């Protein structure tokens, strides 16, 4: 009925409880489960659903051969019920393409899909399940967007796109949409040198995005957006708890306005919640590969270049595969504050598990508690051996 | 609540963006996907769906053997969610038969299915998912209709039927339906000599249909219907850009009131949008077989016998299979104009790929943009080798 | 909102058009289709659906072995969308048991299932999807009911049950339900000597049921019910067009108040519409087995012991298997009269096709037209060879 | 709209009619049926559904190997339509974990799932399909709850948890929830020495739970809760008809305030309805293993230490496998009283049927009749041989 406004703060995060898990690769061993990657979670006023990019085949399908590739004409943004797997029969196609984002503005859902060849890609912006606006590539090198949910405030839904080299300077823009129509866009500003795959959340009329500097930085860039004035800034997470992957070992002191060096031309989508003392960062446990996942509480991580962990929680053990991670919240829950949530993609298959010809994933998802809850670990749970 | 009226013009078409794609044959390699052909897309006020004629078997089913045949007791008009495949479990049967059309009039949906033996076929007209009216064959030779969506204006939904020889003079009629009841019908008029498979769209109280002259013409007949006066005329596309298949090479000058010769007794369902300078034609790239698909902008194609392309877009490369194509629009979108759309059927299997015993298809679908978007190609994406 | 009343007459029946067909056995060759039998069709105010008794296994399932048996703990009345097959994933269980009926009273649906051992069976009467009333066996020999839809009038839904021997005198009762509660019951009256499987329809405040005399009669008993006075009578179809199976050849003169002899202890569920000159009977074409199906127009069949066909239509050829047939109408359609409809069950497998270990069926369904439509035949379409 | 209140008494129970049955293991032999255990049935104001804990694989899936284990990261509370099987495509995930309960309070549904490692488990309380409250383990030894539906009264939904040893003293608590928020909790009181898996029902503003004393008792503990004063008491079923399994033979006299001895450290979830003369108990027929199920009418079982059966009904023969059983009622049915219902889990596979590597179950479910209905038996109906 009315546009949602970001009128609350974050709840205190004293730990993380299980929210959803699909067990897709297990289940898909003997059922009609789509091959996917780049998942996320987004809420409507009445429902939260899983989102991901289909590869246009089932996992047991012979067409699953070659699904390590990221971009093809057979991909599409899909959604499905929370904790169900993405099956042929239960999945709903939001739009066609190989990079996406999606959010609800209180009245209806905007979904964005980018398709095309590397040098001639275009985004299509859907609103109320109809195409409304199209944007052509501006740098002719894999126009791409967040791969997790955007956030709206009084109808304004900012979205971060990047076009250009993944391994050098690129052209990043922030589009401000309303009802699927472009109100304004800006080129990126502040001190982040490279931006990919922003994970966003909203509180008290401000939208905070934690991104991946694929070019230089093993600390993560952060973009803070004011959706009323439609302006933004950027910087890095100051903390020496480094949260990209691959990365170097943790130092004693980080950087606020520059990439922390030691790894080039690589990374992974990740996230944080940045709320003074109530600040928690996600990262893979391995500094070398996408394995494990932990949450660490790092007070003032954004602003304090010496900040270190005061608490943590294991989400996925270092002996199990992880992947992309991202942030969402249910902005339509009852109560005084917004409950921080995230998902972690559990990649299975290639390249790490190359006895199969496919790549897919399952999802685990958590939300914050004000209690100090016991922790478990939450692995994909499939046995590659069964797929041979 | 109220009947839809065709009160808007076409938007300017400066290119075509991806709308939907089902990847049915890929997916159906290892899931319960119905064998289909003769697909289309039609919108309701709240939903757009895929439509097609089922063959009453799955593709991996042994009953898929012999599905090259067009007419059997096992076919039915089905619909399903946009960009999902037509599966056993998600498909809804609109009605029984082997030739169809369907449209929504603003209040509810009319669907028409024709069944029977070649010399004793009948159409059944469903309205609000109940049978309302039946029409018997008048020429006792495969009564047939559009195989894509009809268009309504203030409750009046015209529909073009043909009965008679596919390879000589036939009896074409235009029925004007309202609430599933025949208001009036007319025999075909003007200068089109043969009509099959009209693809229709509506703008500014006029319904334009681009058809297939299976008998003589490699230019396409066009029927223009006035749904208020319930009258019509016909002619051919004047342009020397010839849009049937098979066809001869393009000449320098076409015909307005006569079939352009060089091919007999063959063709394919196709479409155009005919709007002065804002005119775009579809065609297969091959003049010999149903392969490739392109859009060409041909200003005043309907009226200018020398008109040639000023812009184009590749939809399917000449090394990939195509098929029937047709027009639809979402008449219930917001905005000042109607957005032209189309689909192309991607036929796989027989006769061209005869190492399998079946024929099926997938669908790609596009809509117009006012931007100049980059192009990709959109092939079916299945590997026949996997079905052996 | 309000109870439906039977305020209209029958439309004139000048032929029969195709309504629905599921192609279940074809489709079920390679998809998760339940084994069924004893199907029917029933309408709600917004929907018509297929109904049948599941056997609690899929057809390709190894548990399909032995599904020739009629009564087990694994059966259940299911419903599913019109012309879809009864799959594991789309079928809704109305109630548990091995004999049923079901109807909507304008406000909600009553469904009746009978289960139990042969000598201790019970009916459970569901209303608004809750159990409301239970009836115990009165003769301790396979309490059984109609196996097709009942008919309601101002909330009163009569239902015919039989309990006792199938091969000699039995105890037949007519229960008058309202909101699932027994208003009244009566023992059978008039001159019908044995009753099984009544097929019912309603017009002008009267409910007409055509049944099967399994004991003696190859003419069919008819029960006419007045749902206001809650009274009834019975007789036989006078016509020498004999409509049970197996049966003797047609004589020149039939019987009104006695079974026509020549076959004992056998039969099949069937139906008619009995409306003076507008009277049509169904029957198998074979006098020996359940093969073929035809409609014959037999003016005054109910009352004229010499009446013979004046028109007919083939529904299923004598070289294809048939089965049970029954009547339904959409009482909630628009228009001045009720459109007569029926279904025919197409039994496949045992006993006639004993190279498979199962028995199942598909459904074809027709409704009346005021036109004289061409006829086709409507066989199941599956190839037993594919199931070996 | 309004909170439900327990304003009615129980109907007279003169026997039990069939309610629902899923035939899941039969069906799942050749369809995509989830492996489950610990099922139950719960009603909403418009729907009753099946509930159970998924194991995160299909039964034919290779991941079904090892599903005898009770607690893993791959489990989840699911629900699905009544008498359908729990398939991949029709099942809805209520929440993640390996022990649960769920009820509707008249306005919406509360669902509780417990997950974690044995010494660090946590419950998450969902209300209106959002997480609202979390509780950490208090005794660090498999925090666990009812495994069947809770009962609400004016928004207050009590729930019994146990944490601690299964084979000695444990810490049992009764949480009183409203809208998913803890109003109050109490430690267990009265004379029950050990509590597991309470089966609850509600009548006349009182909630009665029949539980399992896993430590010492082969009679069952009973907890009676007053949801207005939020207080409770406990005792045992006095009757010498002993209802746990395994158990000793029935004595002539039981115990009211102490465990009846003869078996230690074992049991099964079960239930009763305790309503003076209208009292019925469930139990396995075997005193040694989970096989068979019967209902026995035992007047004043709760209060009379010499009470014996006056009537009974067989539900599952002693030659067929049973399992957990539990109570539910449709609190939103029409009529003057509440109809007692129950379900029995039919366990198949390990440990008893160890030629397969899995454990799963199907469900049978019954409700009370005021008639004296004939009885049948209701076995799972699957053939293990088919799974080899
Ligand atoms: C039941 O469930 C509960 C809930 O889950 C379980 O309890 C949880 O247990 C986990 C696991 O132990 C805890 O997570 C760890 O938390 C610590 C932080 O806690 C410590 O630090 C605090 C502050 O220290 C600073 O200030 C204090 C004084 O204020 C000062 O004394 C100190 O010297 C320092 O300057 C302390 O406040 C805190 O104490 C409190 O709580 C205690 C319980 O834990 C209790 O006993 C106390 O009495 C007191 O009340 C505590 O000491 C995180 O630091 C740790 O994270 C590090 O370690 C893991 C390895 O396990 C690693 O993966 C992380 O990445 C991280 O360490 C890496 O990064 C660091 C930062 O750069 C670096 O310093 C490290 O060298 C290391 O780096 C290397 O590896 C990384 C990663 O691969 C790589 O990138 C680098 O390059 C490099 O190679 C854990 O998150 C939970 O906090 C705790 N939760 C609760 C509520 O208690 C419980 O165990 C379960 N029960 C059972 C029975 O199983
Ligand atoms: C990123 O994405 C974009 C968007 O997709 C890509 O850009 C697009 O690129 C495509 C492919 O090149 C273009 O499609 C073609 O368009 C042309 C029309 O464009 C030309 O013609 C215009 C007018 O010429 C007339 O007037 C002018 C002056 O007004 C005069 O000079 C001229 O002599 C003539 O009289 C020009 O306006 C126009 O120029 C403008 O745009 C240029 C960019 O393209 C730019 O550089 C210019 O500076 C200027 O601003 C331009 O020259 C179509 O003609 C062409 O279609 C023909 O060719 C394809 C083969 O590719 C064929 O399949 C078609 O069927 C068709 O040719 C057949 O039919 C003709 C008609 O009968 C016949 O003449 C031909 O002989 C041929 O016939 C044979 O084959 C057919 C088919 O099999 C058979 O039936 C016959 O029997 C016979 O055998 C293409 O559609 C897009 O327009 C362009 N889009 C945009 C927005 O620019 C871009 O490449 C992508 N980027 C990357 C990096 O990949
Ligand atoms: C396109 O589609 C249309 C629509 O479907 C097709 O047209 C339809 O064609 C079918 C098939 O031919 C017709 O069905 C048959 O209808 C006849 C009834 O029609 C005749 O009878 C009328 C009256 O005769 C009586 O009165 C008249 C005068 O009033 C008098 O002259 C006569 O001697 C007699 O006393 C005539 O009115 C009627 O004529 C009109 O229509 C003609 C078109 O058909 C037209 O040419 C005329 O000019 C005129 O205007 C016509 O003569 C049914 O009788 C017949 O049913 C019997 O036959 C089939 C075998 O095919 C059988 O299966 C049936 O069971 C039945 O015969 C059995 O039962 C009888 C009753 O006891 C018994 O007498 C028989 O011996 C036989 O019994 C044996 O077998 C049974 C069954 O196995 C067994 O139980 C017994 O024991 C025993 O062994 C057909 O239903 C349609 O009516 C017709 N529809 C229309 C609208 O025209 C058209 O063909 C299709 N076009 C193409 C190109 O394919
Ligand atoms: C069609 O459907 C209907 C409906 O289902 C079928 O009719 C039903 O038939 C069943 C099966 O027979 C009946 O269930 C049994 O009910 C009896 C209770 O009924 C008897 O007891 C009453 C009272 O006796 C006491 O008072 C009376 C006087 O008031 C006094 O005379 C007597 O001495 C005693 O002190 C009688 O009122 C009642 O009579 C009435 O009804 C009769 C019909 O049944 C009719 O003929 C009469 O004329 C009269 O009107 C009747 O005599 C249950 O006791 C019995 O349950 C026990 O037996 C089964 C074995 O079958 C067992 O599994 C149970 O566990 C239980 O026995 C165990 O537990 C006892 C308690 O501790 C113990 O005493 C036993 O030793 C035994 O224990 C051993 O095994 C257990 C279990 O493994 C183990 O735990 C122990 O350790 C130990 O090893 C049945 O439930 C239905 O009541 C009846 N329903 C109706 C409505 O009639 C009908 O058959 C079907 N028709 C067809 C044609 O198939
Ligand atoms: C999932 C897993 O086994 N990850 C291991 C981790 O368990 C770990 F042992 C590791 F050495 C690592 O990168 O830290 O390597 C990972 C990976 O195997 C390797 C190719 O870098
Ligand atoms: C899809 C495809 O390979 N189409 C080719 C086209 O790629 C093309 F090469 C063609 F020669 C043509 O007809 O233009 O033939 C088509 C066809 O193979 C042949 C039987 O006419
Ligand atoms: C379906 C079919 O082939 N039915 C034939 C009919 O085609 C027919 F030939 C028949 F002889 C008949 O009973 O009329 O027999 C049926 C059956 O085969 C036999 C066992 O009685
Ligand atoms: Ca990086
Ligand atoms: Ca032609
Ligand atoms: Ca008979
Ligand atoms: Ca015990």
PDB file of C-alpha atoms in Angstrom, chain A residues 277-354:
ATOM      1  CA  UNK A 277      30.311  -1.650  18.619  1.00  0.00           C
ATOM      2  CA  UNK A 278      27.501  -3.699  17.042  1.00  0.00           C
ATOM      3  CA  UNK A 279      29.667  -4.451  14.026  1.00  0.00           C
ATOM      4  CA  UNK A 280      30.122  -7.880  12.578  1.00  0.00           C
ATOM      5  CA  UNK A 281      32.173  -9.031   9.550  1.00  0.00           C
ATOM      6  CA  UNK A 282      31.937 -12.181   7.482  1.00  0.00           C
ATOM      7  CA  UNK A 283      34.800 -14.013   5.860  1.00  0.00           C
ATOM      8  CA  UNK A 284      35.992 -17.327   4.628  1.00  0.00           C
ATOM      9  CA  UNK A 285      38.228 -19.069   7.099  1.00  0.00           C
ATOM     10  CA  UNK A 286      40.853 -19.950   4.450  1.00  0.00           C
ATOM     11  CA  UNK A 287      42.987 -17.071   3.176  1.00  0.00           C
ATOM     12  CA  UNK A 288      43.623 -19.138   0.062  1.00  0.00           C
ATOM     13  CA  UNK A 289      40.318 -20.627  -1.142  1.00  0.00           C
ATOM     14  CA  UNK A 290      36.564 -20.321  -0.650  1.00  0.00           C
ATOM     15  CA  UNK A 291      36.305 -22.588   2.303  1.00  0.00           C
ATOM     16  CA  UNK A 292      34.794 -22.039   5.703  1.00  0.00           C
ATOM     17  CA  UNK A 293      32.846 -19.077   6.932  1.00  0.00           C
ATOM     18  CA  UNK A 294      32.885 -17.172  10.143  1.00  0.00           C
ATOM     19  CA  UNK A 295      31.346 -14.142  11.678  1.00  0.00           C
ATOM     20  CA  UNK A 296      33.551 -11.925  13.784  1.00  0.00           C
ATOM     21  CA  UNK A 297      32.471  -9.070  15.935  1.00  0.00           C
ATOM     22  CA  UNK A 298      34.917  -6.258  15.350  1.00  0.00           C
ATOM     23  CA  UNK A 299      33.920  -3.115  17.150  1.00  0.00           C
ATOM     24  CA  UNK A 300      34.202  -0.053  14.974  1.00  0.00           C
ATOM     25  CA  UNK A 301      35.687  -2.005  12.098  1.00  0.00           C
ATOM     26  CA  UNK A 302      34.714   0.716   9.638  1.00  0.00           C
ATOM     27  CA  UNK A 303      36.537   3.519  11.499  1.00  0.00           C
ATOM     28  CA  UNK A 304      39.323   1.925  13.652  1.00  0.00           C
ATOM     29  CA  UNK A 305      42.367   0.713  11.820  1.00  0.00           C
ATOM     30  CA  UNK A 306      43.548  -1.417  14.748  1.00  0.00           C
ATOM     31  CA  UNK A 307      40.220  -3.113  15.602  1.00  0.00           C
ATOM     32  CA  UNK A 308      40.243  -6.862  16.298  1.00  0.00           C
ATOM     33  CA  UNK A 309      37.683  -9.549  17.212  1.00  0.00           C
ATOM     34  CA  UNK A 310      35.879  -9.570  20.561  1.00  0.00           C
ATOM     35  CA  UNK A 311      33.518 -12.470  19.665  1.00  0.00           C
ATOM     36  CA  UNK A 312      32.787 -14.781  16.823  1.00  0.00           C
ATOM     37  CA  UNK A 313      30.772 -17.596  15.426  1.00  0.00           C
ATOM     38  CA  UNK A 314      31.695 -20.399  13.077  1.00  0.00           C
ATOM     39  CA  UNK A 315      29.160 -20.843  10.256  1.00  0.00           C
ATOM     40  CA  UNK A 316      30.938 -23.311   7.958  1.00  0.00           C
ATOM     41  CA  UNK A 317      34.059 -25.316   8.961  1.00  0.00           C
ATOM     42  CA  UNK A 318      37.284 -24.864   7.035  1.00  0.00           C
ATOM     43  CA  UNK A 319      36.938 -28.425   5.701  1.00  0.00           C
ATOM     44  CA  UNK A 320      33.681 -27.486   3.820  1.00  0.00           C
ATOM     45  CA  UNK A 321      33.200 -25.323   0.738  1.00  0.00           C
ATOM     46  CA  UNK A 322      31.754 -21.752   0.930  1.00  0.00           C
ATOM     47  CA  UNK A 323      31.305 -19.028  -1.666  1.00  0.00           C
ATOM     48  CA  UNK A 324      29.559 -15.720  -2.075  1.00  0.00           C
ATOM     49  CA  UNK A 325      27.874 -14.240   0.936  1.00  0.00           C
ATOM     50  CA  UNK A 326      25.478 -11.358   1.285  1.00  0.00           C
ATOM     51  CA  UNK A 327      23.160  -9.373   3.430  1.00  0.00           C
ATOM     52  CA  UNK A 328      19.366  -9.010   3.570  1.00  0.00           C
ATOM     53  CA  UNK A 329      16.849  -8.009   6.193  1.00  0.00           C
ATOM     54  CA  UNK A 330      13.158  -8.451   6.606  1.00  0.00           C
ATOM     55  CA  UNK A 331      12.203  -4.727   6.644  1.00  0.00           C
ATOM     56  CA  UNK A 332       8.514  -5.691   7.224  1.00  0.00           C
ATOM     57  CA  UNK A 333       8.901  -7.683  10.536  1.00  0.00           C
ATOM     58  CA  UNK A 334       7.269  -6.428  13.701  1.00  0.00           C
ATOM     59  CA  UNK A 335       9.398  -4.832  16.445  1.00  0.00           C
ATOM     60  CA  UNK A 336      11.595  -1.929  17.253  1.00  0.00           C
ATOM     61  CA  UNK A 337      14.681  -2.720  15.195  1.00  0.00           C
ATOM     62  CA  UNK A 338      15.782  -4.488  12.016  1.00  0.00           C
ATOM     63  CA  UNK A 339      17.231  -7.987  12.408  1.00  0.00           C
ATOM     64  CA  UNK A 340      20.498  -8.341  10.480  1.00  0.00           C
ATOM     65  CA  UNK A 341      20.603 -11.457   8.262  1.00  0.00           C
ATOM     66  CA  UNK A 342      22.923 -13.055   5.710  1.00  0.00           C
ATOM     67  CA  UNK A 343      23.307 -16.023   3.424  1.00  0.00           C
ATOM     68  CA  UNK A 344      26.430 -17.981   2.407  1.00  0.00           C
ATOM     69  CA  UNK A 345      26.531 -19.798  -0.971  1.00  0.00           C
ATOM     70  CA  UNK A 346      28.054 -23.314  -0.576  1.00  0.00           C
ATOM     71  CA  UNK A 347      29.690 -23.973  -3.908  1.00  0.00           C
ATOM     72  CA  UNK A 348      30.048 -27.586  -5.016  1.00  0.00           C
ATOM     73  CA  UNK A 349      31.752 -29.020  -8.072  1.00  0.00           C
ATOM     74  CA  UNK A 350      34.241 -27.248 -10.288  1.00  0.00           C
ATOM     75  CA  UNK A 351      36.886 -26.070 -10.082  1.00  0.00           C
ATOM     76  CA  UNK A 352      37.696 -27.512  -6.669  1.00  0.00           C
ATOM     77  CA  UNK A 353      35.742 -30.752  -7.079  1.00  0.00           C
ATOM     78  CA  UNK A 354      36.592 -31.586 -10.666  1.00  0.00           C
TER      79      UNK A 354
END
